[PDB]
Design a protein around this ligand. Structure first.
Ligand SMILES: [Fe+3]
Ligand SMILES: [Fe+3]
Lengths: 181, 511, 832
């Protein structure tokens, strides 16, 4: 499992907050407790690998293994941590999902996001087409017969290097887990 | 019967001054006798090394140093004498066997009667066994959680090699937690509590040279003239758990080897090369501070008159061998007495001094029972290489002047930054910033040091000038400014943080 | 090279004028010489000259040149560049920022330049002298440790211009001093005392005017002629500042004065143990001064653990014969024990005071009221003095064998310059009372009264004292004095000393007896915490009542409630005295007053008193004993338990003084049967050894441990935490010194620039009161802090202000200070 870092430089921002007591004395505005809580927003990139090779062994029934990896992928996209969500509801779904089945070695696309992205515009489309570009040069420099598929919540661009654009996350997961053996 | 004597059994990793290939295990007598042939000896645990080097120095001082001053201008004459033993070059084998002849029966770890620095009476009189886990360091004890240092579930106790047993044993007998150990029933009296280790949470400074021999005799602190005493394994009669521990002005009472605050025991296996169970508990219950303060440590005075050792700091080990460089300086009250009586010229060494190197064994810990980290620190021989390679007197002196300068000022701003963060956080609320500030400060400021030693263009200041050129001061401004940057937004924190931030600007000698 | 005169040596308060460095070096050396002839004693000069294998002529010459070099380190660039001075003449040696002090600069440069003058390169003499004068500001620096074969340049001395000038200055003061020879050897102590000498001369000529004074005939050049002249004019008149600054016998006396003149061959120490008020002073200065002549140093010094004894015997004992740390610098000086003991305390500028004690055969008092901490501190101190070949004398009451043994043992160790081994037999394992003890340095034989004189020594005769333990009921942990009051104090109304444990039953028993006193003997209070003046009037009206003039005047009475102040040299003789349980030693001191001067026998008191009877209050059983929490919070539980158990087996028998009880104060420390509580016994023993250990880690090393090196002489505002401090209680509201808001509490006094006159010292000191160290000291406030203008006086810094608030009409209010409220009433004194 890899750490999830932003695709563009984001600085923390101080959220000045205060607690207000409901029992007022004859000197009002004596709020409960002044304080400052730091928050930050941004478009995170995430990555993870599942080695069924040295996996299925420890288990057996390729069908049970198949169920475990399929529910794993669905949980990887579905879940979102539970940190301060009750105060900042940040439940979301990935704007781009790329599952690839490689028969030689796992590979991450983190260096694609090495040069930070400057903004004032959105970051999802730029990140999508830039991940595509990196997949293209890396694919044409380390040629390999692997399987690639991806879903996206934006029909503007066409991502060639990412494989065959499936229609939805669960369809992508089903066709990829099936294509995995 | 199972038996294991440190005399001939190999438990010390030793390597010669030769090729430096395939080092191997040696016993105590064997590494001592042929020390002249061996470069150095070591054991993986720096605590165990900090006590091992103390018993080695005490032995070499039992025979070589003679550990007894004469009486005609004693100190001086003593320095002369040891300078003569150094001039000879090595150890006398009949002296080694002459010293074990008096104690050939003492060094067995598993001796059925009066073992080596253990309490035989503690075999019985203890209801439960402390377990090997508590004896081994970095191993999960009964209350600890089984996550780190390899799982050890209080059960299936992986038996330890007798070597590892004397390492962890010698270390625990030194550094030791304080509180709630195995209970003992002394004279019908039971008292479940224990005191802390004598060296707990302190960095030790041991000088080391080319050959192990000169290192041993250089690690000999001037035996305070007084009632000649003996180490722990020489005492003819076993100590009394109650009562005040014997007092000792001699070196055996200043190297902390006369009486220990703990009492461990090893339960031998039938094979004789493995430990299966152990006992760790209080050996002395009445407090006693050791007179004639430890020459290895660095001591600093607080208010009210108490003198205490400067505690260790993992933050200083963020860069390798940081304290090792104390051979430069020196430094303002920050210097062990052993160095102050063996490294300078007021002694009589002639050419081994021109190759002397410092080493430091540090194990930061809380003073009660919680441990954080260990680390060793051997000075970089490259700093000697630079001074020798040029063969120019004025440049040989300008280089060392540049290292001395950069080191002194480096630590100066380190402590100035510590008080800066302590006052900044302690005044902001009317701390947690010291850890981050210091860690990032040394981690970041050491590549600058190596940048200044090779007179390469460093941040802030370009090569060519006299000293450090006031550069890591700017590094301290960087670390301090970023560790507290996101929190100095509102004017309160801003003005306090700034008011304490206007100190780093000194010394700050301009161009 | 022609020497320049632009370099400075003094800049503070010169109104824009600069003082040449060379003139300061020279006049400093002159001060060293003139003090080496007029100030120092011939015997101490014999000691130092002997230890350095040289003679007075060349030794004095050497140290004079050394004093002339004390500030040579000032020829750096960061030192003169402090103010606008043109440095473009000689380039090089740019600013590095090492923050070195001029003292450090000299201490690091001297070991490598003077070898051209003859000192052995890398030797020991040049090292000890180098660091010796290099630490002329109170803190000694380590010996130069270098890793480069060009040490001069690695320390930052690379410009040949600068080095050529400092070599020029070196040679200039070298021929100016007469070019002395190199001493073949030196040892630590010698370097320490002579270091005190050099810093003394420096601070000496250092003072302001001076400076302005001779600031008229400045040298026009640096030739040998002009410098010889200036140096020769300081030699003309340096003593100006010197004088301007102020720098029927009893058996015992007859036996010491009789046989001791044969044993007085040289340096040693005399421990004298005589009864209270018997006149041990006469034998103390008699033998002390005869022995002072034997060693050849006129001035002396007495350390007393009080304040009024100094102001009383200062004059009482004088007609028959100014800043901090310079008090000991006077030839005749006597003060407390703290400033003298502090000489061996690990503090800055210790060599100065140590030098002050080097010239005087010191005498000390009350070594019985000295806890193991203070005992080991002064112990090592006298060990050092030991290696400094200075004889000493001690006055004390009865002392256990451990005390005498350890002290004479320490001094003997200083004589031999090493401490005993495994088999060395103790020198004092038996001591009599009254009994003297004399030990010599070069011989080491210890002699006592019993050796030559088998016949006992006579003293003041008296009737054997009797002690009777009475059963006192316990209420709420405290004691019910009522019972004893109505049991033994009944025949007094038809016709007294009450000693308490602490303030609880001091103001407690005094109030508990004030009601009684309202019925109406007389009930007057005199105790630990009263205004010095108030208890000076009470003590006057008591020393004249129950003392010398009590019997001698004739108006003897027809009740005294006090604290352990009776412990210190009071004149008292009562028939009825009632005190609490306490150490056998304390019973000895306090009880050394029962029928004190029956010798005179001129007081006719009723038949009621016919036997000397002391009553010891104590709690009873409810199998080992137990005592109140407040009594044993200041005393040892096991000790008090031994006192109880020992007094029980007496079967109410008399105890003779001074013969039977001394073997009981020794016995209590000898047999363990007096205490069955092993936990408490080894508890107080544990903490006494732990306190002594807590002491030996904050004191200077041993005589030889610091012989080759003097760095271990300063590892760094500390003081001592046991056990009394002088306090000042001012009234605030406005600041006024009297309860009637008349005399304002001054911010500063009557003197030049607010300088405090000696009479200001006697007044402000005449306004103090002694408070003991307590948990309130841990929590000190701002009002307790004295202003900066007051700290530069020695007798006034250790005086914290305890404010109190008086109202508009004059009512005094107990003001809180450190968790407790203090109230100065004219009857019970300070209340907290
Ligand atoms: Fe000076
Ligand atoms: Fe000076």
């Amino acid at each position: 499992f890899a750490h999830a870092f932003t695709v563009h430089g984001t600085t923390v921002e101080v959220d000045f907050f205060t607690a207000v007591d409901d029992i007022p004395k004859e000197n009002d505005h004596g709020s409960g407790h002044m304080n400052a809580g730091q928050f930050s927003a941004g478009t995170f990139y995430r990555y993870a690998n599942v080695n069924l090779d040295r996996l299925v062994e420890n288990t057996g029934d390729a069908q049970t293994a198949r169920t475990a990896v399929a529910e794993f992928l669905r949980a990887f996209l579905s879940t979102v941590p539970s940190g301060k969500q009750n105060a900042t509801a940040a439940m979301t779904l990935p704007d781009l999902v790329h599952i690839a089945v490689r028969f030689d070695r796992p590979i991450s696309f983190a260096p694609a996001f090495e040069t930070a992205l400057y903004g004032s515009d959105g970051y999802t489309l730029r990140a999508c087409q830039e991940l595509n570009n990196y997949a293209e040069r890396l694919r044409e420099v380390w040629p390999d017969d692997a399987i690639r598929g991806y879903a996206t919540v934006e029909n503007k661009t066409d991502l060639a290097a990412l494989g065959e654009r499936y229609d939805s996350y669960p369809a992508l997961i089903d066709a990829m887990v099936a294509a995995a053996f | 019967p199972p038996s294991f004597d440190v005399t001939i059994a190999p438990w010390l990793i030793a390597r010669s001054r030769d090729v430096l290939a395939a080092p191997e295990m040696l016993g105590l007598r064997d590494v001592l006798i042929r020390s002249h042939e061996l470069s150095d000896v070591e054991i993986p645990l720096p605590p165990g090394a900090a006590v091992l080097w103390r018993i080695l120095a005490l032995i070499t001082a039992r025979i070589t140093g003679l550990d007894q001053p004469p009486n005609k201008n004693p100190k001086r004459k003593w320095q002369a004498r040891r300078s003569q033993i150094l001039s000879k070059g090595r150890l006398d084998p009949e002296a080694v066997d002459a010293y074990f002849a008096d104690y050939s029966e003492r060094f067995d770890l598993f001796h059925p009667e009066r073992p080596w620095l253990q309490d035989p009476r503690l075999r019985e009189e203890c209801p439960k066994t402390s377990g090997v886990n508590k004896l081994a360091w970095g191993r999960t004890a009964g209350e600890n959680q089984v996550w780190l240092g390899g799982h050890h579930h209080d059960l299936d106790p992986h038996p330890l090699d007798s070597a590892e047993a004397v390492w962890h044993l010698l270390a625990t007998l030194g550094y030791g937690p304080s509180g709630m150990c195995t209970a003992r029933v002394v004279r019908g009296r039971s008292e479940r509590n224990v005191t802390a280790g004598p060296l707990r949470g302190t960095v030790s400074y041991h000088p080391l040279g080319r050959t192990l021999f000169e290192s041993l005799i250089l690690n000999i602190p001037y035996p305070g003239t007084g009632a000649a005493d003996l180490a722990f394994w020489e005492q003819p009669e076993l100590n009394d758990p109650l009562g005040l521990p014997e007092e000792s002005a001699g070196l055996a009472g200043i190297l902390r080897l006369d009486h220990f605050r703990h009492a461990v025991l090893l339960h031998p296996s039938p094979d004789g090369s493995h430990v299966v169970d152990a006992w760790v508990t209080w050996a002395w219950r009445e407090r006693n501070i050791s007179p004639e303060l430890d020459p290895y440590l660095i001591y600093q005075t607080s208010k009210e008159g108490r003198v205490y050792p400067r505690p260790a700091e993992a933050e200083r080990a963020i860069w390798r061998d940081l304290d090792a460089l104390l051979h430069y300086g020196e430094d303002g009250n920050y210097r062990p007495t052993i160095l102050d009586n063996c490294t300078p010229l007021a002694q009589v060494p002639q050419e081994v001094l021109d190759s002397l190197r410092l080493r430091a064994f540090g194990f930061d810990q809380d003073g009660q029972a919680r441990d954080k980290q260990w680390f060793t620190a051997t000075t970089p021989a490259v700093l000697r290489w630079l001074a020798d390679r040029e063969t120019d007197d004025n440049e040989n002196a300008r280089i060392v002047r540049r290292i001395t300068l950069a080191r002194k000022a480096a630590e100066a701003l380190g402590r100035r930054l510590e008080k800066a963060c302590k006052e900044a956080w302690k005044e902001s609320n009317s701390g947690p910033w010291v850890q981050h500030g210091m860690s990032r400060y040394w981690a970041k400021a050491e590549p600058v040091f190596w940048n200044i030693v090779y007179d390469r263009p460093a941040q802030g200041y370009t090569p060519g000038m006299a000293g450090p050129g006031n550069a890591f001061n700017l590094v301290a401004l960087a670390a301090y400014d970023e560790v507290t940057g996101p929190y100095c937004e509102r004017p309160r924190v801003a003005k306090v943080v700034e008011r304490h931030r206007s100190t780093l600007f000194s010394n700050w000698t301009p161009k | 090279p022609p020497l320049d005169l632009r370099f400075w040596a003094k800049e503070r308060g010169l109104r824009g004028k600069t003082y040449p460095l060379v003139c300061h070096s020279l006049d400093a050396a002159a001060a060293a010489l003139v003090l080496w002839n007029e100030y120092l004693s011939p015997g101490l000069r014999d000691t130092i000259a002997s230890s350095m294998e040289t003679d007075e002529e060349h030794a004095g010459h050497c140290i004079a040149f050394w004093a002339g070099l004390h500030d040579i380190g000032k020829l750096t660039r960061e030192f003169q560049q402090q103010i606008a001075i043109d440095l473009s003449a000689y380039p090089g040696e740019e600013l590095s920022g090492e923050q070195r002090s001029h003292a450090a600069a000299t201490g690091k440069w001297l070991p490598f330049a003077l070898p051209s003058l003859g000192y052995p390169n890398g030797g020991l003499v040049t090292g000890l002298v180098a660091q010796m004068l290099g630490g002329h500001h109170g803190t000694f620096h380590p010996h130069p440790s270098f890793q480069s074969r060009n040490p001069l340049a690695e320390f930052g001395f690379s410009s040949p211009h600068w080095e050529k000038q400092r070599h020029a200055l070196l040679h200039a003061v070298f021929d100016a001093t007469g070019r002395p020879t190199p001493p073949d050897m030196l040892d630590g102590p010698t370097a320490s005392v002579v270091c005190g000498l050099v810093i003394l001369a420096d601070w000496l000529v250092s003072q302001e005017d001076f400076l302005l004074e001779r600031l008229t005939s400045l040298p026009a050049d640096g030739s040998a002629s002009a410098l010889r002249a200036h140096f020769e004019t300081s030699l003309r008149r340096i003593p100006s500042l010197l004088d301007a600054a102020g720098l029927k016998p009893n058996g015992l006396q007859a036996s010491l004065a009789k046989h001791l003149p044969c044993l007085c061959t040289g340096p040693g120490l005399v421990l004298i143990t005589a009864p209270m008020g018997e006149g041990k002073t006469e034998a103390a200065y008699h033998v002390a001064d005869l022995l002072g002549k034997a060693t050849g140093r006129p001035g002396r010094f007495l350390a007393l653990p009080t304040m009024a004894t100094a102001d009383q015997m200062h004059t009482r004992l004088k007609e028959y014969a100014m800043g901090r740390k310079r008090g000991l610098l006077a030839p005749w000086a006597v003060g407390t024990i703290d400033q003298a003991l502090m000489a061996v305390l690990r503090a800055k500028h210790n060599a100065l005071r140590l030098f002050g004690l080097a010239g005087k055969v010191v005498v000390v008092d009350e070594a019985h009221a000295v806890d193991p901490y203070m005992q080991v501190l002064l112990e090592q101190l006298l060990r050092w003095l030991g290696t400094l070949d200075v004889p000493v004398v001690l006055l004390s009451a009865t002392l256990h064998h451990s005390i005498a043994n350890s002290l004479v043992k320490a001094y003997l160790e200083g004589a031999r310059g090493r401490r005993w081994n495994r088999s060395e037999p103790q020198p004092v394992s038996e001591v009599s009372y009254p009994g003297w003890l004399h030990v010599d340095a070069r011989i080491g034989k210890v002699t006592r009264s019993s050796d030559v004189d088998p016949l006992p020594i006579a003293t003041t005769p008296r009737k054997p004292l009797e002690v009777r333990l009475v059963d006192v009921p316990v209420k709420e942990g405290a004691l019910n004095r009522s019972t004893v009051l109505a049991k033994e104090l009944t025949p007094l109304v038809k016709q007294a000393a009450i000693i308490c444990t602490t303030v609880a039953e001091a103001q407690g028993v005094y109030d508990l007896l004030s009601q009684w006193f309202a019925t109406l003997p007389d009930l007057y209070l005199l105790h630990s915490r009263f205004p010095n003046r108030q208890r000076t009037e009470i003590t006057a009206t008591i020393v004249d009542l129950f003392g010398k003039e009590g019997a001698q005047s004739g108006r003897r009475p027809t009740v005294l409630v006090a604290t352990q102040v009776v412990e210190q040299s009071l004149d008292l003789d009562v028939d009825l005295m009632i005190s609490d349980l306490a150490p056998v030693s304390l019973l000895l001191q306090r009880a050394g007053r029962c029928w004190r001067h029956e010798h005179l026998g001129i007081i006719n008191r009723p038949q009621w008193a016919k036997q000397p009877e002391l009553v010891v209050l104590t709690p009873e059983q409810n199998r080992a004993p137990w005592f109140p929490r407040s009594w044993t919070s200041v005393y040892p539980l096991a000790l008090l338990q031994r006192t109880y158990t020992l007094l029980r087996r007496r079967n109410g028998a008399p105890v003779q003084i001074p013969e039977d009880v001394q073997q009981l104060v020794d016995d209590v420390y000898d047999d363990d049967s007096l205490a069955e509580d092993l936990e408490a016994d080894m508890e107080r023993m544990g903490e006494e050894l732990a306190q002594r250990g807590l002491a030996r880690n904050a004191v200077i090393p041993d005589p030889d441990d610091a012989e080759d090196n003097l760095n271990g002489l300063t590892e760094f505002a500390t003081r001592f935490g046991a056990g009394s401090v002088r306090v000042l209680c001012y009234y605030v509201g406005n600041r006024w010194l009297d309860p009637e808001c008349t005399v304002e509490f001054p911010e500063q006094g009557t003197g030049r620039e607010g300088r405090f006159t000696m009479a200001d010292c006697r007044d402000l000191v005449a306004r103090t009161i002694p408070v003991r160290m307590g948990p309130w000291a841990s929590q000190l406030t701002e009002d307790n802090h004295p202003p900066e203008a007051w700290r530069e006086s020695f007798y006034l810094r250790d005086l914290v202000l305890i404010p109190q608030r008086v109202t508009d009409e004059g009512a005094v209010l107990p003001t809180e200070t450190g968790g407790r409220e203090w109230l100065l009433d004219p009857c019970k004194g300070l209340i907290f």
